[PDB]
Amino acid sequence: SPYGPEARAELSSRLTTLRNTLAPATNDPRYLQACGGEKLNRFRDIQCRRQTAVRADLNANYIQVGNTRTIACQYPLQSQLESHFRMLAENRTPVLAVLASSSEIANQRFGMPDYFRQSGTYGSITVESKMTQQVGLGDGIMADMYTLTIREAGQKTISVPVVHVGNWPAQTAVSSEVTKALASLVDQTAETKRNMYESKGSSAVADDSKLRPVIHCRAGVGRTAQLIGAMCMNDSRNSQLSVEDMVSQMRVQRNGIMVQKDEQLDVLIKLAEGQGRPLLNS
Numbered sequence: 001s002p003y004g005p006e007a008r009a010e011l012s013s014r015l016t017t018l019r020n021t022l023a024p025a026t027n028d029p030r031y032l033q034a035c036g037g038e039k040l041n042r043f044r045d046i047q048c049r050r051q052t053a054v055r056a057d058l059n060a061n062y063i064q065v066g067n068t069r070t071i072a073c074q075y076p077l078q079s080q081l082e083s084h085f086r087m088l089a090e091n092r093t094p095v096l097a098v099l100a101s102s103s104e105i106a107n108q109r110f111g112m113p114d115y116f117r118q119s120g121t122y123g124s125i126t127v128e129s130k131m132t133q134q135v136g137l138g139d140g141i142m143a144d145m146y147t148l149t150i151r152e153a154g155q156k157t158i159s160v161p162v163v164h165v166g167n168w169p170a171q172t173a174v175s176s177e178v179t180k181a182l183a184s185l186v187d188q189t190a191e192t193k194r195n196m197y198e199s200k201g202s203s204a205v206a207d208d209s210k211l212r213p214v215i216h217c218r219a220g221v222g223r224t225a226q227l228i229g230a231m232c233m234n235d236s237r238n239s240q241l242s243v244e245d246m247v248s249q250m251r252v253q254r255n256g257i258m259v260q261k262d263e264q265l266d267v268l269i270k271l272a273e274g275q276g277r278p279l280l281n282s
């Protein structure tokens with residue numbers, strides 16, 4: 001059985017060993033380190049792959065599942081904000097998927113600045129949050145969208161489409177139905193903006209590491225990984241890409257925690273099933 005419990009068990013199995021072998025060790029060469037002082041990882045057990053690191057001072061990586069390339073990162077710390085904004089800008093960010101909950105954000109204890117819903121200045125950078133549309137995704141899950149405008153002297157103004165999912169509690173998985181609706185919208189959005197830079201004759205088209213959708217929850221590995229996997233199978237070029245690959249790739253590109261929970265794997269496993277996509281690798 002392709003999706004038989006034995007099958008699923010072998011997957012989780014391989015995936016477990018991988019999560020284990022990828023666990024960051026003190027001063028792990030495979031991961032980006034905190035520069036003499038300032039905390040770099042929101043969670044000091046959920047680190048960033050140095051190989052793929054986007055910025056020397058951000059827990060964020062360049063991930064490529066098959067032909068699908070994006071950027072997964074943690075929720076920026078107060079300090080990271082400026083460099084965060086800098087990245088999204090340079091990346092010519094086509095879409096910014098934020099899967100962390102409004103509950104998590106409002107929670108000052110959590111150190112998650114409402115960096116994208118409100119307008120503010122973070123140094124030489126001034127941000128304008130423009131709330132655009134709201135779209136239900138099912139099960140009562142909502143997609144709140146804003147247009148982030150990053151302005152900076154000498155730098156090019158760059159508005160970034162933002163897709164926020166408020167009611168997606170952390171450490172959980174949403175209806176494969178929902179999970180699916182979202183991927184589409186996230187892709188939809190990224191498509192519209194991307195096409196705009198293409199039309200404007202932009203140059204971030206030639207550069208591969210650019211025009212990358214950015215996704216992140218809090219630690220950028222659970223809810224985030226789910227979306228990515230979702231967005232992956234949603235790319236009509238990843239034919240034959242296994243679930244095994246999706247998870248084993250994201251984890252080598254960011255950290256072994258990718259696809260944190262099980263109910264998260266399950267969804268991907270379910271989305272993959274309906275597509276007749278292989279779970280394990282032969």
Ligand SMILES: */C=C\S(=O)(=O)Oc1ccccc1
Nearest residue numbers: 170217218219220221222223
């Ligand atoms: C992006 C990860 S998450 O979905 O926010 O889940 C968490 C993982 C570790 C610690 C807190 C939250």
